[PDB]
Amino acid sequence: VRMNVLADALKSINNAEKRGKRQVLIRPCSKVIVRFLTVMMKHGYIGEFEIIDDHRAGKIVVNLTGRLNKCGVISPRFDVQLKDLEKWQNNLLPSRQFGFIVLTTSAGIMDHEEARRKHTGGKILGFFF
Amino acid sequence: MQNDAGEFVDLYVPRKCSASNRIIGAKDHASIQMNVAEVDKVTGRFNGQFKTYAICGAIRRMGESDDSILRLAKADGIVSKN
Amino acid sequence: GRVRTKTVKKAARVIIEKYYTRLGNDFHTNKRVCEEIAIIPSKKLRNKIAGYVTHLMKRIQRGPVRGISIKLQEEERERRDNYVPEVSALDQEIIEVDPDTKEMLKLLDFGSLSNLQVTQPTVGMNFKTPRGPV
Amino acid sequence: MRAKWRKKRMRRLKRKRRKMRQRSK
Amino acid sequence: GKCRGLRTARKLRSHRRDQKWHDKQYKKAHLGTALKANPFGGASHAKGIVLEKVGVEAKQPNSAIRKCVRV
Amino acid sequence: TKKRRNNGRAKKGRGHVQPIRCTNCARCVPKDKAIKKFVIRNIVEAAAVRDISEASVFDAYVLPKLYVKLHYCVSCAIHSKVVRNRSREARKDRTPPPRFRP
Amino acid sequence: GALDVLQMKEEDVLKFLAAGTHLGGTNLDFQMEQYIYKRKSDGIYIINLKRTWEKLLLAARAIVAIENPADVSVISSRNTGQRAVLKFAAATGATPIAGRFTPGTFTNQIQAAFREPRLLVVTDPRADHQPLTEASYVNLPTIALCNTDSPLRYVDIAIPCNNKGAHSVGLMWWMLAREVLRMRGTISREHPWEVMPDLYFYRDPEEIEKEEQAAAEKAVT
Amino acid sequence: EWMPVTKLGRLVKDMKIKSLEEIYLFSLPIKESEIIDFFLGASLKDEVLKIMPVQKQTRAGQRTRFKAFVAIGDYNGHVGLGVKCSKEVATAIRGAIILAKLSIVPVRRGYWGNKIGKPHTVPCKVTGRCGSVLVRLIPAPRGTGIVSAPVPKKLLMMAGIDDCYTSARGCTATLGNFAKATFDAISKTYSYLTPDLWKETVFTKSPYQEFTDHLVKTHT
RNA sequence: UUACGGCGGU
RNA sequence: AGAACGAAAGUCGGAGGUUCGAAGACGAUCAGAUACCGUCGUAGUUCCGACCAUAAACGAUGCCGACUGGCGAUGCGGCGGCGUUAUUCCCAUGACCCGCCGGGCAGCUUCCGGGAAACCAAAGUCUUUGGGUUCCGGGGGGAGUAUGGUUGCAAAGCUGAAAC
Ligand SMILES: [Zn+2]
C-alpha cells in the first residue's frame, strides 16, 4: 500500500536533512527516482549516491550535502501547460532566483527552466529548493 | 550577494556550521566557534597557528558536537588515523 | 524570642572576619572592643551583637565555619597544597586486570611493555539488583 | 437542567403529541 | 483527509455543494423558504397601515420605552 | 481538561474489567481504579501482648496475624484519608510512601 | 595526537590502571559507544584508552589555543574535584570556581559575580549541569570529562574517562594539567613532571593530622 | 558618561570594534543598550505601537500595569521590537526603547528578478509565527510598495525594505503577537541558506581573541 | 446528625 | 449500496426465583421529604428462544503506508552464550542468568518538531502548505423538535428541517 514511491522517497530525504544526517537510505528504487535525484545532484543539492542493486527492487543511499531546504512532491501528477507553468512557479517556489519544479516531459525529466528552453510542457512531478 | 552588476550588496556573510552545513544566525547564542592549536612535528609544542571550527547551536543542543568535532578532526589530520 | 535578626548576625560576622586578632570568648571584653571599633547607635544592639560574637568564638574554634578569616584560610593550605606523600599511591608495580582488558592493552600494543598480572572474573553475571519492591 | 433529563421531559412530551395527533386524526 | 487525484472532480464538486447547505447566508439565499417568510417578500421598503401604537420595554441594562407601531 | 494520562485506571489493552465492591460503603468500582490496601495487622493488639503470653499454655507462642484485604472507592478513600490530594507535579510518581515501622 | 611525540607513552597506562580511569559503571550513553571497548562479566563497561588519550590531547589543544591563560574557567561542583580544580588553576594559570556555582554567573551582568570566560572545562556533565546550560546562552564551548552514564548535550570535547572515583578525577585533571603545560616551553617532553598525581586527589577524612604525627616522632622532636 | 560592564561594551567605547556586522556574525549576546546606540546613533527613530493595560486581581482591588510595544530601526536593514511592563505608562514606554535596541537584528534584502541595483525586497518568502499568528512576507516586483496591514508595515518600512506582498492568518487583532510574528519573519532572512551562500566560509578572527591586548595590557 | 434563600443597575 | 455482530436497561414466551432490588408499603430525619438512612419488597437481576441496536459503545483521537531521538522493563515466539538448579550418578528439554531480532500492551526522559495551551515520540514530517481513501464540522439556541418516509410487539431507532 505504497501508492507513490517518489512521495515516500523524497519524504525520507527531507526528514534526515533537517535531522543533520549525512546519509539516507531510500528503500525502494525506481528509474523515476534516480532521474529525480540526477536533477538535483546536477544542480548541486545532493552528492554522490549509490544504487544498491539487488534482485528485487533496489535501495539507494544518498550523501546529503546540507544545501537542501525542502524536497517535496506534488502527489497528484497534475498536468502543466507552458501557459500554466508560470503560476505553478510562484505558488510553490520560495523565490525566482533559486529552486526548481521538476516535471516529466516527453523528452525527459527536466527543470522548469530547462523545459522552457525547449517547448515541451508536461506533468508536474515534484519540486526542490 | 553578487548582483548582475557583480557587486556585494549584503550587510555581511553569515557563518555556517561545519557539522550540518546550516547557517548560524545572528542571535543563535549557543553556536560556538572554537580553536584547535596544532603542534609542530618534531618538538611537539605550540607553533602559533590553529584551526577554527564553527558548530551551530541547534546541532550543539542535540548533543553531538563531540561526534562532530572529532569527525572534522578526523578529516584534518589530528586525531589518531585508525 | 531569642532569635537574632539579620543586622545583628551580619554586623557580627564582619567583626570576626576582620578583627579576629582582637577578640576572645569573654563577653565583657568583646563588648568593649565592639564599642571602640564599630559605630553602634544604641547600647542594646551593641551587646546583642557582642553576644553573637562570643557565640562564634566557641564555634570557629572547633571547625571550618563560613570563616574566610586569615588563620582559617591559611591552615587549609597545609592539607591541599602540602601532603605530598613520600610514597606514591599510583606506584605499586603489581596491579590487577581481567583477561578482557589484557586484550584491550594488547591492541594498544602494550602487552609486553608492562608486567600487569591478570585476575580471573569469578563466575556470575549477578549484577543488576533485583527488580520490584520486594 | 441535566441534558439526560431534558431528554426525558421531551421524550415524555413527544409521546404526548404523538397521541393527540393519533386521537384527532 | 481529503481527495487529491486527477480523477475525483465528481466527488469533490458533489461534496462541496451539499456542504454549502450548512452556513446560513448561502442557505437563506438559495433554499427559498426564507424569502417566502420575510414580510417584505424580498424588497427594501413596503407601505402599510398603522393599527396600534405599542411601547416595548428596553433590554437588560437599559430602562426606557421604545415607541413602536403595529403595521 | 484531561487531568491524568492514564484515566485514573490501570487498564490499557482491554475493553472491560470486573466490578468489585467497596468495603465500607459497598459501592461498585472497577478492579483497577479501586484503592487497594492489604493489612497484615496482628490480631493481638500489641498493647495486649504481655497479658496473654503469661496466660498462655506455652512458653513461646507464635501469635497468629490477621490478613484482610481492603479496597475502596475513591470517594471513601479520600474521606478516610488513606490517599491525599497532591500537587500537579508530585503526581507523576508511582512509588509508595515509606514504612517507618520502628 | 597523530605524532610520535604525542603517543601513548606506556608509563601513563601504569598510572591510568592504578587509578581506575577505564571502568565505566554498568550502563552507557548512546553517544559513547565509539569510546567504549566491551562489557565485562560484571556489567562494567571498560573504555578504550586510546580514545580517552586522543581526546585529552584534543582538549589540551583547545586550552593552549586560548590567548589569555587567566581566561579559561575551570569549574567543579562536587567535592571530589574541588582540590584538583584549585591547583589545576594554580598550575595552568586558569581561574577556578569551586563550591556552589551560583546561577547567573555567565549571563547576569549586574552583580559582581560575573565571569565572562571563553572556554569552560567541567568535572561532570550531569552533576555540574548548571554551568553547561548557562554556557549555552553565552556561546561558550565546553569540555567535560565524562563517564558512560553522563549525557552529552552541550559538551564538545567530552573526555570519556571517569567522574566517580577520587583517584580517577584527580589523575585526569593531573594528566590534563601536565600536557597543557607541556605544549608550551614549561616541560620539555623529556624529564617527567615532578608534580605528583597524588597531590590532586580528594582529601581524606579528619584522621589526616593524626596519622602523620604518628609517624613523625623522629623529625620534629 | 558610560562605563561598560562586559567585554563587548568594553571594546566598543575605545573604538576598536568597527561597524556592528561582525558581532552579528560571531553571534554575540549584546548586553548594554549603549553599544547599539554607539554605532547607530543619529539614525534611529523610535515610534511605539500600542500601550495596553494588562492587570491582575488582588486581595484589595487590582494591580494596574501597562504594556508598551515599541519598534525601533533605521532605514538600512536593522529592526528592533521591545516589550516591557511597568506600573506607569511613561516608565514602561521608556524602558521598552532600551529593550528594543537591545534586541536588534539585521534584515536581508533581495531582488524579485533583474538584479539591477540596490536590493529592494525579501530574498525569499519567509514566515514568522507567534502564538497563533503567522505572517508570510512575499517578494514583490519592483515599484509595488508594502501591501500589508498597518502595524507590520510600520516595521517593514522601519526595515528599509521597499516592497513586499504580505499575507497573515490568525488573531491579527492581537497587536503584540502580530508584531512579534512579523518581527520573527524578518529575523530569519539571514537564517536561510540560498545558493549564493554555498561556498564554505573562511573564518576570520573573533574579537575576543583578536583583541586580547586591550584586556591584558590595558584592562590589567 | 441538621446548615435553605440573598431584588434590578452601577 | 447492502450486511454480521453489538454492554446494561427494555419487550414477548417458557424454566427458575438464593441474593439484590426500580415501583410500592412503612419507620425515621426534616419547615417540608414524593430524597439521602433503615426494615420489607413487585417487576427485574439467572437460563433457553425471539426481538430492540443504543452508551462518557472514550485513548472523548477512522483505516492503510513510510520516515523521524534515547533508556530500562514487560508478554509471546526465535537465535546465541558464563554459569546455577532438576530422576540429572551424564544427557536434551524445563527453572533462573546475559544479550540480540520481530510483533505487541505500555512506561520514563528529550529545545525532534508541533500546539491556543494543557500536553503529544505522535496530536511530528504543515503558509518550506499535495502518501492513499472514508465519514463528518461551519456562532449560540430553537432542535435531534416539526413533518414525510422507513424499521419495531411496543419502547423507540435511522433520516431530518424551517419560522423565530
Ligand atoms: Zn467507599
CSV table of N, CA, C and O in Angstrom, one decimal, chain H residues 102-187:
chain,number,residue,atom,x,y,z
H,102,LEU,N,18.1,46.7,22.5
H,102,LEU,CA,18.9,45.6,23.0
H,102,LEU,C,18.7,44.4,22.2
H,102,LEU,O,19.6,43.5,22.2
H,103,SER,N,17.6,44.2,21.5
H,103,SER,CA,17.2,43.1,20.7
H,103,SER,C,17.0,43.6,19.3
H,103,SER,O,15.9,43.9,18.9
H,104,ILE,N,18.1,43.8,18.6
H,104,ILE,CA,18.1,44.3,17.2
H,104,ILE,C,18.7,43.3,16.3
H,104,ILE,O,19.7,42.7,16.6
H,105,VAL,N,18.1,43.1,15.1
H,105,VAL,CA,18.5,42.0,14.2
H,105,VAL,C,18.7,42.7,12.8
H,105,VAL,O,18.1,43.7,12.5
H,106,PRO,N,19.6,42.2,12.0
H,106,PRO,CA,19.7,42.7,10.6
H,106,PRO,C,18.8,41.9,9.7
H,106,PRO,O,18.6,40.7,9.7
H,107,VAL,N,18.2,42.7,8.8
H,107,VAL,CA,17.3,42.1,7.8
H,107,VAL,C,18.0,42.0,6.5
H,107,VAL,O,18.8,42.9,6.1
H,108,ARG,N,17.8,40.9,5.7
H,108,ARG,CA,18.5,40.7,4.5
H,108,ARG,C,17.5,41.1,3.3
H,108,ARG,O,16.3,40.8,3.4
H,109,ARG,N,18.1,41.8,2.4
H,109,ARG,CA,17.3,42.3,1.3
H,109,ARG,C,17.7,41.7,0.0
H,109,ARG,O,18.9,41.3,-0.2
H,110,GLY,N,16.8,41.5,-0.9
H,110,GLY,CA,17.0,40.7,-2.2
H,110,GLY,C,16.4,41.4,-3.4
H,110,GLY,O,16.2,42.6,-3.4
H,111,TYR,N,16.1,40.6,-4.4
H,111,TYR,CA,15.5,41.0,-5.7
H,111,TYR,C,14.4,40.2,-6.1
H,111,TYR,O,14.3,39.0,-5.7
H,112,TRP,N,13.4,40.7,-6.8
H,112,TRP,CA,12.4,39.9,-7.4
H,112,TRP,C,12.9,39.2,-8.7
H,112,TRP,O,12.3,38.3,-9.2
H,113,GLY,N,14.0,39.7,-9.2
H,113,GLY,CA,14.5,39.4,-10.6
H,113,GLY,C,15.0,40.6,-11.2
H,113,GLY,O,14.7,41.7,-10.7
H,114,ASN,N,15.9,40.5,-12.1
H,114,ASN,CA,16.6,41.6,-12.8
H,114,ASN,C,17.4,42.4,-11.7
H,114,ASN,O,17.1,43.5,-11.4
H,115,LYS,N,18.4,41.8,-11.2
H,115,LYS,CA,19.2,42.3,-10.1
H,115,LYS,C,20.0,43.5,-10.5
H,115,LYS,O,21.2,43.4,-10.7
H,116,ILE,N,19.3,44.6,-10.6
H,116,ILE,CA,19.8,45.8,-11.4
H,116,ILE,C,20.6,46.8,-10.5
H,116,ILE,O,21.5,47.5,-11.0
H,117,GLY,N,20.4,46.8,-9.2
H,117,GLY,CA,21.0,47.8,-8.3
H,117,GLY,C,20.8,47.5,-6.9
H,117,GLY,O,21.1,46.4,-6.4
H,118,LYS,N,20.4,48.5,-6.1
H,118,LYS,CA,20.2,48.3,-4.7
H,118,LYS,C,19.1,47.3,-4.4
H,118,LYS,O,18.0,47.4,-5.1
H,119,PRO,N,19.2,46.4,-3.5
H,119,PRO,CA,18.1,45.4,-3.3
H,119,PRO,C,17.0,46.0,-2.6
H,119,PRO,O,17.1,47.0,-1.8
H,120,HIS,N,15.8,45.5,-2.8
H,120,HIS,CA,14.5,46.2,-2.5
H,120,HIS,C,13.5,45.3,-1.8
H,120,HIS,O,12.6,45.9,-1.1
H,121,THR,N,13.6,44.0,-1.8
H,121,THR,CA,12.6,43.2,-1.2
H,121,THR,C,13.3,42.0,-0.5
H,121,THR,O,14.5,41.9,-0.4
H,122,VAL,N,12.5,41.2,0.2
H,122,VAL,CA,12.9,40.0,0.8
H,122,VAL,C,13.5,39.0,-0.2
H,122,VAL,O,13.1,39.0,-1.3
H,123,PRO,N,14.6,38.3,0.2
H,123,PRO,CA,15.2,37.4,-0.8
H,123,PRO,C,14.4,36.2,-1.2
H,123,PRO,O,14.3,35.8,-2.3
H,124,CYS,N,13.7,35.6,-0.2
H,124,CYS,CA,12.8,34.5,-0.4
H,124,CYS,C,11.5,34.9,0.4
H,124,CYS,O,11.5,35.8,1.2
H,125,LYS,N,10.5,34.0,0.3
H,125,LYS,CA,9.3,34.2,1.1
H,125,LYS,C,9.6,33.5,2.5
H,125,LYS,O,10.0,32.4,2.5
H,126,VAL,N,9.3,34.3,3.5
H,126,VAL,CA,9.6,33.9,4.9
H,126,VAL,C,8.4,33.9,5.7
H,126,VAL,O,7.4,34.5,5.3
H,127,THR,N,8.4,33.2,6.9
H,127,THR,CA,7.3,33.1,7.8
H,127,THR,C,7.7,33.3,9.2
H,127,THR,O,8.8,32.9,9.6
H,128,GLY,N,6.9,34.0,10.0
H,128,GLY,CA,7.1,34.1,11.4
H,128,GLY,C,5.8,33.8,12.1
H,128,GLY,O,4.8,34.4,11.9
H,129,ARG,N,5.9,32.8,13.1
H,129,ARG,CA,4.7,32.5,13.9
H,129,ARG,C,5.0,33.1,15.3
H,129,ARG,O,6.1,33.0,15.8
H,130,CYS,N,3.9,33.6,15.9
H,130,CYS,CA,4.0,34.0,17.3
H,130,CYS,C,2.6,33.7,17.9
H,130,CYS,O,1.7,34.5,17.8
H,131,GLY,N,2.5,32.6,18.6
H,131,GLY,CA,1.3,32.1,19.2
H,131,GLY,C,0.4,31.4,18.1
H,131,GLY,O,0.6,30.3,17.9
H,132,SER,N,-0.4,32.2,17.5
H,132,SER,CA,-1.4,31.6,16.5
H,132,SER,C,-1.3,32.4,15.2
H,132,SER,O,-1.8,32.0,14.2
H,133,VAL,N,-0.6,33.5,15.3
H,133,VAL,CA,-0.5,34.5,14.1
H,133,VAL,C,0.7,34.1,13.3
H,133,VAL,O,1.9,34.1,13.8
H,134,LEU,N,0.5,33.8,12.0
H,134,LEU,CA,1.7,33.6,11.1
H,134,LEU,C,1.6,34.7,10.1
H,134,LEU,O,0.6,34.9,9.4
H,135,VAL,N,2.8,35.3,9.9
H,135,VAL,CA,2.9,36.4,8.9
H,135,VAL,C,3.8,35.9,7.8
H,135,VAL,O,4.9,35.3,8.1
H,136,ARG,N,3.4,36.0,6.6
H,136,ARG,CA,4.1,35.5,5.4
H,136,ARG,C,4.5,36.7,4.6
H,136,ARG,O,3.7,37.4,4.0
H,137,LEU,N,5.8,36.9,4.5
H,137,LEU,CA,6.3,38.1,3.7
H,137,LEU,C,6.8,37.6,2.4
H,137,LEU,O,7.8,36.8,2.3
H,138,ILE,N,6.3,38.1,1.3
H,138,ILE,CA,6.5,37.5,-0.1
H,138,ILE,C,7.1,38.6,-0.9
H,138,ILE,O,6.8,39.7,-0.9
H,139,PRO,N,8.2,38.2,-1.7
H,139,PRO,CA,8.8,39.2,-2.6
H,139,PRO,C,7.9,39.7,-3.7
H,139,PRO,O,7.3,38.9,-4.4
H,140,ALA,N,7.9,41.0,-3.8
H,140,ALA,CA,7.1,41.7,-4.7
H,140,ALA,C,7.9,42.3,-5.8
H,140,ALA,O,9.1,42.5,-5.6
H,141,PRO,N,7.4,42.4,-7.0
H,141,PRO,CA,8.1,43.1,-8.1
H,141,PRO,C,8.3,44.6,-7.8
H,141,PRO,O,7.6,45.2,-7.0
H,142,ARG,N,9.3,45.1,-8.4
H,142,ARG,CA,9.8,46.5,-8.1
H,142,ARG,C,8.7,47.5,-8.4
H,142,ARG,O,8.1,47.5,-9.5
H,143,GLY,N,8.6,48.5,-7.5
H,143,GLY,CA,7.6,49.5,-7.7
H,143,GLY,C,6.2,49.2,-7.1
H,143,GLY,O,5.2,49.8,-7.4
H,144,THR,N,6.2,48.2,-6.2
H,144,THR,CA,4.9,47.8,-5.6
H,144,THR,C,4.5,48.6,-4.4
H,144,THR,O,3.5,49.2,-4.3
H,145,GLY,N,5.5,48.6,-3.5
H,145,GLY,CA,5.2,49.1,-2.1
H,145,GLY,C,4.8,48.0,-1.2
H,145,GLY,O,4.7,46.8,-1.5
H,146,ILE,N,4.6,48.4,0.1
H,146,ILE,CA,4.3,47.4,1.1
H,146,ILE,C,2.8,47.2,1.2
H,146,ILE,O,2.1,48.1,1.5
H,147,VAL,N,2.4,46.0,0.8
H,147,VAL,CA,1.0,45.6,0.7
H,147,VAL,C,0.8,44.8,2.0
H,147,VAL,O,0.9,43.6,2.0
H,148,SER,N,0.4,45.5,3.1
H,148,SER,CA,0.1,44.8,4.3
H,148,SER,C,-0.8,45.6,5.2
H,148,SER,O,-1.2,46.8,4.9
H,149,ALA,N,-1.2,45.0,6.3
H,149,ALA,CA,-1.8,45.7,7.5
H,149,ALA,C,-0.9,46.9,8.0
H,149,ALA,O,0.3,46.9,7.7
H,150,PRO,N,-1.5,47.9,8.7
H,150,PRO,CA,-0.6,49.0,9.1
H,150,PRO,C,0.5,48.6,10.0
H,150,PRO,O,1.7,49.0,9.7
H,151,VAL,N,0.3,47.8,11.1
H,151,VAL,CA,1.4,47.5,12.1
H,151,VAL,C,2.5,46.6,11.6
H,151,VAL,O,3.7,46.9,12.0
H,152,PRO,N,2.4,45.6,10.6
H,152,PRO,CA,3.6,45.1,10.0
H,152,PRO,C,4.2,46.0,9.1
H,152,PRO,O,5.4,45.9,8.8
H,153,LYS,N,3.4,46.9,8.4
H,153,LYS,CA,4.0,47.9,7.6
H,153,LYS,C,4.8,48.9,8.4
H,153,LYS,O,5.8,49.5,7.8
H,154,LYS,N,4.5,49.2,9.6
H,154,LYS,CA,5.3,50.0,10.5
H,154,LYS,C,6.7,49.5,10.7
H,154,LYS,O,7.6,50.3,10.8
H,155,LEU,N,6.8,48.2,10.8
H,155,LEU,CA,8.1,47.5,10.9
H,155,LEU,C,8.8,47.2,9.6
H,155,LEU,O,10.1,47.2,9.6
H,156,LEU,N,8.1,47.0,8.5
H,156,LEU,CA,8.8,46.8,7.3
H,156,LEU,C,9.3,48.1,6.7
H,156,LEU,O,10.5,48.1,6.2
H,157,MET,N,8.6,49.2,6.8
H,157,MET,CA,9.2,50.5,6.5
H,157,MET,C,10.4,50.8,7.3
H,157,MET,O,11.3,51.5,6.9
H,158,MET,N,10.4,50.4,8.6
H,158,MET,CA,11.5,50.6,9.5
H,158,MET,C,12.5,49.5,9.3
H,158,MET,O,13.5,49.5,10.1
H,159,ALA,N,12.4,48.6,8.3
H,159,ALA,CA,13.4,47.7,8.0
H,159,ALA,C,14.2,48.1,6.7
H,159,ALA,O,15.1,47.4,6.3
H,160,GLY,N,13.8,49.2,6.2
H,160,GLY,CA,14.5,49.7,4.9
H,160,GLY,C,14.1,48.8,3.7
H,160,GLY,O,14.9,48.8,2.8
H,161,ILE,N,13.0,48.2,3.8
H,161,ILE,CA,12.5,47.4,2.6
H,161,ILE,C,11.6,48.2,1.8
H,161,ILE,O,10.9,49.1,2.3
H,162,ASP,N,11.6,48.0,0.5
H,162,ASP,CA,10.8,48.8,-0.4
H,162,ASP,C,9.4,48.3,-0.6
H,162,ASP,O,8.4,49.0,-0.5
H,163,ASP,N,9.3,47.0,-0.9
H,163,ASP,CA,8.1,46.4,-1.4
H,163,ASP,C,8.0,44.9,-1.0
H,163,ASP,O,8.9,44.2,-1.1
H,164,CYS,N,6.8,44.5,-0.6
H,164,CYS,CA,6.6,43.2,0.0
H,164,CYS,C,5.1,42.9,0.0
H,164,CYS,O,4.3,43.6,0.5
H,165,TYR,N,4.8,41.8,-0.7
H,165,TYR,CA,3.5,41.2,-0.6
H,165,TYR,C,3.4,40.5,0.8
H,165,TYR,O,4.4,39.9,1.2
H,166,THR,N,2.2,40.6,1.4
H,166,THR,CA,2.1,40.0,2.8
H,166,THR,C,0.7,39.4,3.0
H,166,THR,O,-0.3,40.0,2.6
H,167,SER,N,0.7,38.2,3.5
H,167,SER,CA,-0.5,37.5,4.0
H,167,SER,C,-0.3,37.2,5.4
H,167,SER,O,0.8,37.3,6.0
H,168,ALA,N,-1.5,37.0,6.1
H,168,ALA,CA,-1.5,36.8,7.6
H,168,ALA,C,-2.7,36.0,7.9
H,168,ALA,O,-3.8,36.3,7.5
H,169,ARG,N,-2.5,35.0,8.8
H,169,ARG,CA,-3.6,34.2,9.3
H,169,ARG,C,-3.6,34.3,10.8
H,169,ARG,O,-2.5,34.4,11.4
H,170,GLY,N,-4.8,34.3,11.4
H,170,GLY,CA,-4.9,34.2,12.9
H,170,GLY,C,-5.6,35.3,13.6
H,170,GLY,O,-6.3,36.1,12.9
H,171,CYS,N,-5.3,35.5,14.8
H,171,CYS,CA,-5.9,36.6,15.6
H,171,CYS,C,-5.0,37.8,15.4
H,171,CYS,O,-4.1,38.1,16.3
H,172,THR,N,-5.1,38.5,14.3
H,172,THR,CA,-4.3,39.7,14.0
H,172,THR,C,-4.8,40.9,14.7
H,172,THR,O,-4.2,42.0,14.5
H,173,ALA,N,-5.9,40.8,15.5
H,173,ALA,CA,-6.3,41.8,16.5
H,173,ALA,C,-5.6,41.6,17.8
H,173,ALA,O,-6.1,42.1,18.9
H,174,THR,N,-4.4,41.0,17.8
H,174,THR,CA,-3.6,40.7,19.0
H,174,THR,C,-2.2,41.3,18.7
H,174,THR,O,-1.2,40.6,18.5
H,175,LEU,N,-2.2,42.6,18.6
H,175,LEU,CA,-1.2,43.5,18.2
H,175,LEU,C,0.2,43.1,18.7
H,175,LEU,O,1.2,43.3,18.0
H,176,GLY,N,0.3,42.7,19.9
H,176,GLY,CA,1.6,42.2,20.5
H,176,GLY,C,2.1,41.0,19.8
H,176,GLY,O,3.3,40.9,19.6
H,177,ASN,N,1.2,40.0,19.5
H,177,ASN,CA,1.7,38.8,18.8
H,177,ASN,C,1.7,39.0,17.3
H,177,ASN,O,2.5,38.3,16.7
H,178,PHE,N,1.0,40.0,16.8
H,178,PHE,CA,1.1,40.3,15.4
H,178,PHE,C,2.2,41.2,15.1
H,178,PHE,O,2.6,41.3,13.9
H,179,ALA,N,2.9,41.8,16.1
H,179,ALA,CA,4.1,42.5,15.9
H,179,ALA,C,5.3,41.6,16.1
H,179,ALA,O,6.3,41.7,15.4
H,180,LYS,N,5.2,40.6,17.0
H,180,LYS,CA,6.3,39.7,17.2
H,180,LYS,C,6.3,38.6,16.1
H,180,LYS,O,7.4,37.9,15.9
H,181,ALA,N,5.2,38.3,15.4
H,181,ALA,CA,5.2,37.4,14.4
H,181,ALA,C,5.9,37.9,13.1
H,181,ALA,O,6.7,37.2,12.5
H,182,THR,N,5.6,39.2,12.8
H,182,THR,CA,6.3,39.8,11.7
H,182,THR,C,7.7,40.1,12.0
H,182,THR,O,8.6,40.2,11.1
H,183,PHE,N,8.1,40.4,13.3
H,183,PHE,CA,9.4,40.6,13.7
H,183,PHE,C,10.2,39.3,13.5
H,183,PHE,O,11.4,39.3,13.2
H,184,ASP,N,9.6,38.1,13.8
H,184,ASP,CA,10.2,36.8,13.6
H,184,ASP,C,10.5,36.5,12.2
H,184,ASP,O,11.5,35.8,11.9
H,185,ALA,N,9.7,37.0,11.3
H,185,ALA,CA,9.9,36.7,9.9
H,185,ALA,C,11.0,37.5,9.3
H,185,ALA,O,11.8,37.0,8.4
H,186,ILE,N,11.3,38.7,9.8
H,186,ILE,CA,12.4,39.5,9.3
H,186,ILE,C,13.6,39.2,10.2
H,186,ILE,O,14.6,39.9,10.1
H,187,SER,N,13.5,38.3,11.1
H,187,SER,CA,14.6,37.8,12.0
H,187,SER,C,15.3,36.6,11.4
H,187,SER,O,16.3,36.1,11.9
